[PDB]
Amino acid sequence: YGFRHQNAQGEGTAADYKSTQSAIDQITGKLNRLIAKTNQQFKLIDNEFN
Amino acid sequence: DKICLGHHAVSNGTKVNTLTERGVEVVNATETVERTNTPRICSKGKRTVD
Amino acid sequence: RYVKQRSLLLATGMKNVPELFGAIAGFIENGWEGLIDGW
Amino acid sequence: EVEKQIGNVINWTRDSITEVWSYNAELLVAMENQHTIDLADSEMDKLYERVKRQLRENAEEDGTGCFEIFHKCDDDCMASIRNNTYDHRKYREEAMQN
Amino acid sequence: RVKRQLRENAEEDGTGCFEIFHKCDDDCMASIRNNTYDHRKYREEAMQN
Ligand SMILES: *[C@@H]1O[C@H](CO)[C@@H](O)[C@H](O)[C@H]1NC(C)=O
Ligand SMILES: *[C@@H]1O[C@H](CO)[C@@H](O)[C@H](O)[C@H]1NC(C)=O
Ligand SMILES: *[C@@H]1O[C@H](CO)[C@@H](O)[C@H](O)[C@H]1NC(C)=O
Ligand SMILES: *[C@@H]1O[C@H](CO)[C@@H](O)[C@H](O)[C@H]1NC(C)=O
């Protein structure tokens, strides 16, 4: 999310960091919450070769 | 000459997991799992045969 | 799939106010019944 | 001693269901916790600007949560703001030498 | 956040863009972007507008 100005001396596009890193880590929060592991181990109940 | 506005806080909060954190400090909280049984077959109103 | 409830109504309109953001049942008090085209 | 083959099905089934509820348990709380906090933040903001268009052409702002009245407002005037009956046209004529 | 920072200074159009009412060169344009614009310098001349 950035800025853009306009005046008698030209133009200029900047950015804004505080809001940018306010947004990235929450998705990173959602990512690291979703990227997780099962601890539950399942055996062999049904045969296959007969 | 000014009328500010605020909320309420305590000294010691409790730490709860939201959907985008671990451990946020929150003014009150509530247990949702049960841990303590009663070591007795509470059999009021049922004609029990041991 | 078999549930145990027998009725579970699902909304498809706004809150009915006859005569999170605080305008429907908010600082606009009542609905209109004399408005029949738009919402 | 339940029989071997049928006892393995029950333990398989039970621990399978156990992963389902224990998954449901912690999302239900975490989803609920998130809505609890902005619920109390929504109610903070609705109260806040309610004072603003009540003090319609009267207060400026700083951005801390605090308004700034531009004429002498003693404690009954300070009481009339807090019970939702401030009548701004009394003061609009002298909230404009400011 | 830019709006009540530019408290009695900007009008609006509704595109996402403010409209300053006095000559604001690039240090003035820099003071808005780092959250330290001090509006009472300019409130006396954001009101011939
Ligand atoms: C907070 O939650 C607990 C639940 O353990 C409850 O006993 C208590 O009344 C609640 N309120 C306050 C103000 O502590
Ligand atoms: C099923 O699990 C229980 C422990 O939960 C164990 O005591 C029992 O032996 C298991 N059954 C078989 C057939 O392994
Ligand atoms: C404030 O609100 C109360 C409750 O309606 C009312 O009785 C009172 O007259 C109001 N005004 C002042 C100045 O207290
Ligand atoms: C803008 O912000 C930086 C960082 O605090 C500060 O050093 C600087 O003096 C500010 N003002 C201007 C005009 O750059």
- Asked if residue B46 lies in contact with residue D62, where contact means CB atoms within 8 angstroms, the answer is no
Pocket test for ligand 3, best of D84, D85, D86 (most atoms within 8 A of CB): D85
Report the C-alpha gap between C15 and D61 in whole angstroms: 34
Pocket test for ligand 4, best of E34, E37, E38, E41 (most atoms within 8 A of CB): E34
Partner-chain contact D61 E5, CB within 8 Å: no
Length of chain E: 49
Residue E43's CB: how many other CB atoms inside 10 A? 13
Residue D26, token pair as written in the block: 């912690």
Q: How was this structure determined?
A: cryo-EM
Long-range contacts of A24-30 (CB under 8 A, 24+ apart): A26/B20, A29/B20, A29/B21, A30/B19, A30/B20
- Asked if residue A5 lies in contact with residue A12, where contact means CB atoms within 8 angstroms, the answer is yes
In this structure, which residue's CA is closest to atom 11 in ligand 2? D7
Burial of D8 (0-12, 13-18, 19+ CB in 10 A): middle
> Can you list the positions of beta strands (E) in A1-50?
5-7, 10-12
Partner-chain contact E25 A3, CB within 8 Å: no
Look at the alpha carbons of C20, C21, C26, C30 in this order and tell me if their dihedral is positive or negative. Answer: negative
Resolution in A: 3.0
- Asked if residue A2 lies in contact with residue A16, where contact means CB atoms within 8 angstroms, the answer is yes
Whether E34 is in the pocket of ligand 4, judged by its Cβ within 6 Å, is yes
| Chain A residues inside the 8 Å CB shell of E25 | 7-9
- Maximum Cα–Cα distance for chain B, whole Å? 78
Whether D85 is in the pocket of ligand 3, judged by its Cβ within 6 Å, is yes
Report residues whose beta carbon is within 6 angstroms of any ligand 1 atom: B 28, 30
> Can you list the positions of beta strands (E) in E1-49?
10-12, 18-20
- Asked if residue A40 lies in contact with residue D15, where contact means CB atoms within 8 angstroms, the answer is yes
D12 touches A: beta carbon within 8 Å: yes
